[PDB]
Amino acid sequence: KVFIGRLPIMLRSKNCYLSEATESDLYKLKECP
Amino acid sequence: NQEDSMIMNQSSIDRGLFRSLFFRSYMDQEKKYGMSITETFEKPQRTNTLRMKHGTYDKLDDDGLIAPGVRVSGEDVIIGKTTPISSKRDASTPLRSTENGIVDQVLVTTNQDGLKFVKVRVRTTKIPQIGDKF
Amino acid sequence: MIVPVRCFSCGKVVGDKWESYLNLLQEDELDEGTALSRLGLKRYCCRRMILTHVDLIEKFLRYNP
Amino acid sequence: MSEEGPQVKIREASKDNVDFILSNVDLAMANSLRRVMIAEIPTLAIDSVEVETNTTVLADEFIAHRLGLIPLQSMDIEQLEYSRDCFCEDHCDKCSVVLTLQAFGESESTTNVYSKDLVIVSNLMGRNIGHPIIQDKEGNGVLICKLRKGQELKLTCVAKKGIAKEHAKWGPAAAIEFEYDPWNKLKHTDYWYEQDSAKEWPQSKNCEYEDPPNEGDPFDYKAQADTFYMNVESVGSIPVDQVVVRGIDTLQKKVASILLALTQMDQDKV
Amino acid sequence: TATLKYICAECSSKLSLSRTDAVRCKDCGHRILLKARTKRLVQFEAR
Ligand SMILES: [Zn+2]
Ligand SMILES: [Zn+2]
Ligand SMILES: [Zn+2]
Numbered sequence: 001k002v003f004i005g006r007l008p009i010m011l012r013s014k015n016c017y018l019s020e021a022t023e024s025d026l027y028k029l030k031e032c033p
Numbered sequence: 034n035q036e037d038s039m040i041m042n043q044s045s046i047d048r049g050l051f052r053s054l055f056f057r058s059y060m061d062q063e064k065k066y067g068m069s070i071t072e073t074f075e076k077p078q079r080t081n082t083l084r085m086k087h088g089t090y091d092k093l094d095d096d097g098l099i100a101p102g103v104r105v106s107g108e109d110v111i112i113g114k115t116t117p118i119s120s121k122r123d124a125s126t127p128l129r130s131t132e133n134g135i136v137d138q139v140l141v142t143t144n145q146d147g148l149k150f151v152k153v154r155v156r157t158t159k160i161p162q163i164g165d166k167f
Numbered sequence: 168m169i170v171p172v173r174c175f176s177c178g179k180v181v182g183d184k185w186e187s188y189l190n191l192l193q194e195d196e197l198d199e200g201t202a203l204s205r206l207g208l209k210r211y212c213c214r215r216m217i218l219t220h221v222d223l224i225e226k227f228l229r230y231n232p
Numbered sequence: 233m234s235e236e237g238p239q240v241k242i243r244e245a246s247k248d249n250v251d252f253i254l255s256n257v258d259l260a261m262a263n264s265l266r267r268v269m270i271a272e273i274p275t276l277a278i279d280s281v282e283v284e285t286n287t288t289v290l291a292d293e294f295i296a297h298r299l300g301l302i303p304l305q306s307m308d309i310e311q312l313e314y315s316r317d318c319f320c321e322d323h324c325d326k327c328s329v330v331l332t333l334q335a336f337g338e339s340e341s342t343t344n345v346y347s348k349d350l351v352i353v354s355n356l357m358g359r360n361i362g363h364p365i366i367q368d369k370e371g372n373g374v375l376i377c378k379l380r381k382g383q384e385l386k387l388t389c390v391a392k393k394g395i396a397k398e399h400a401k402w403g404p405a406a407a408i409e410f411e412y413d414p415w416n417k418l419k420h421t422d423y424w425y426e427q428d429s430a431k432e433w434p435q436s437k438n439c440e441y442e443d444p445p446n447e448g449d450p451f452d453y454k455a456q457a458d459t460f461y462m463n464v465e466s467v468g469s470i471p472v473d474q475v476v477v478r479g480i481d482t483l484q485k486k487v488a489s490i491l492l493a494l495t496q497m498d499q500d501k502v
Numbered sequence: 503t504a505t506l507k508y509i510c511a512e513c514s515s516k517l518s519l520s521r522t523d524a525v526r527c528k529d530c531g532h533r534i535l536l537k538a539r540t541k542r543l544v545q546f547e548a549r
Contacts, residue, residue: 027229030511045175047400047549049297096520100540102283135292135544139537141508143525158293169290170375172301173467177407178400180303180367180467182374183347212407227289228342228380232514279548285539293546300548389548399549 039167046161055157056137059126061112063148072124074098074149076113080121086110088127098151099136106133111153132157168223176212184208188217248367248465250472251409253441255459259412262460269479270405271396272486275469276306276361278331278401279394284386290377295387300401302347302374304329304391306469307360314393329362329391330354333376337383345385347374362391365468404470404478409463414439418455508535 009015018031026033034040042050063072074097076090088108092099097113099105105128112126134157144150172182184206191202199218208214237256244251254262281296288295318327332351337343347364348371356362366373379385394402413420414436423429438461464479466472507518510527511534517527526533 028231028512030230033226042176044178044396044400044403048173048175048178048301049171050175052297054291094540096537098537100537100542102540102542102544104544137291141525141535141537143533149525156291158297169377172298172374172376173303177405177465178301178403178467179406179465180365180374182298182301182376183366183368183372185375187369210407224289224378225342228378230289230380231512232287232382232509277548281546281548283544283546292544296546296548401548 051161053159055159056154058152058154059111060152061114061126062144062150070117073115075115077115077121082121084122086123086125086127098139101136101138103136105136105155171216171220174213174216179213181213181216248472250464250476253461257458259457265479265483266408266410268483269408269475272482273404273478274309274393274395275402275404276304276309276391278389279392280390282388286385287383288377288379288385295377299389303365303468305361305363305365309361311359312361323390325355325357331389333387335379335385337379337381342378344378345376346372347376348372367468404475406465406467411438412457412460414442415445418457506538508537
């Protein structure tokens with residue numbers, strides 16, 4: 001059960017908070033919709 | 034308009050035809066040196082060194098940055114910074130001699146290490162001129 | 168990106184007419200071409216102005232400080 | 233029956249248009265005015281914004297630009313000298329009109345900033361000047377900009393004389409109409425066609441007011457040009473008439489200044 | 503009354519401070535921060 005490095009995740013992909021987020025969410029995260 | 038160039042209604046340019054914008058984002062951090070030797074964001078001057086610049090530092094508030102409203106021009110400074118070497122050597126950041134306008138928003142955040150990270154944006158409205166491309 | 172105050176070609180006042188145009192539709196349920204004929208916008212110079220402007224500001228306003 | 237020459241005969245009329253039939257003059261003359269109206273008619277608008285606070289999305293100069301376009305009153309203008317002439321270091325009530333503007337986004341539902349909100353702070357000297365020309369249905373006129381929650385915007389403007397040459401924002405103009413010899417009897421054009429010149433090319437409302445061709449007749453080479461169907465509009469600042477009278481005037485002024493320089497010029501010599 | 507200085511990206515609200523005064527906002531750990539306009543009045547031509 002060890003940790004190994006960081007993976008520069010892609011945007012709008014599954015592992016991105018944005019994948020789920022919508023309209024409101026984005027505008028508040030500043031991120032342009 | 035002869036030879037792949039044209040004539041543009043001046044009047045209309047005025048009423049705002051084709052006016053655009055333009056932002057640039059000069060930027061800088063505080064260098065370190067293991068042995069706790071770090072740089073600084075101040076508004077320096079004499080203090081031994083002589084190692085400074087040429088653009089009116091004035092516009093630099095005390096935090097070593099320019100407040101958003103300021104109207105920057107020639108080579109004025111946007112970031113007053115120094116460095117310790119063994120005593121107040123400069124590492125400031127002047128404007129792009131060519132460009133000039135209005136500060137638009139400065140922001141100061143930490144940074145993975147801890148260093149002071151600052152980005153500065155400058156706004157400029159660019160009106161269509163005789164040489165502009167279309 | 169807000170209503171272009173006055174037309175580029177002829178400059179005839181056009182920064183007010185906005186809200187009135189947006190209404191001569193969602194409510195007065197008219198069609199563009201006519202809506203504009205109604206707001207006095209005759210020749211196309213001033214017409215294309217409204218019929219094309221995209222009121223982005225709204226999507227801007229929708230942000231924060 | 234009277235009047236030396238260049239006579240008019242207003243066709244239709246309205247508060248925002250003077251569709252008239254000007255006749256018996258030099259086309260040169262006609263155009264001359266036409267221009268004068270668009271170009272050199274004294275007006276008034278803002279020419280100096282002083283941003284105090286602004287949170288809007290439109291950054292300064294954006295607003296600062298439109299503010300110059302917001303048509304302002306100018307009926308009397310001719311009694312409010314250009315800054316440049318007056319002796320007040322910078323500006324004064326004898327050359328400029330000062331306005332204010334302040335907005336805060338209270339209604340948690342898009343608050344609007346309209347030209348109606350401008351605030352004349354300087355002595356109007358008791359003269360129709362500096363009023364935010366409004367033709368809006370409601371009376372809000374010229375939407376300046378919008379804003380959200382705690383979005384503020386404090387300004388302070390300064391109107392000055394100015395004419396369409398210096399900038400368009402001083403254009404009392406708007407857009408005039410112009411036409412003559414609707415049946416191209418002088419042949420100032422050579423209609424392009426694919427077939428019947430007459431078909432492809434639409435006729436004009438200004439034909440009724442003039443005799444059709446009538447084949448047979450040869451070509452009147454002595455044919456010149458009077459009768460011009462203009463349509464002086466307006467943006468407000470000036471009553472549709474003045475944007476024509478004053479037009480008829482400013483031109484006439486200059487024409488004299490030429491004589492004026494021809495006098496001052498003579499007197500000169502030892 | 504009283505002057506201000508810097509601001510928070512989302513919990514935006516005057517903040518200020520200086521050297522070794524951390525960087526975070528007095529709330530939102532969100533370590534951003536803008537500097538807000540100068541008391542100095544700006545000015546532009548109406549064209
Ligand atoms: Zn137009
Ligand atoms: Zn004066
Ligand atoms: Zn915060």
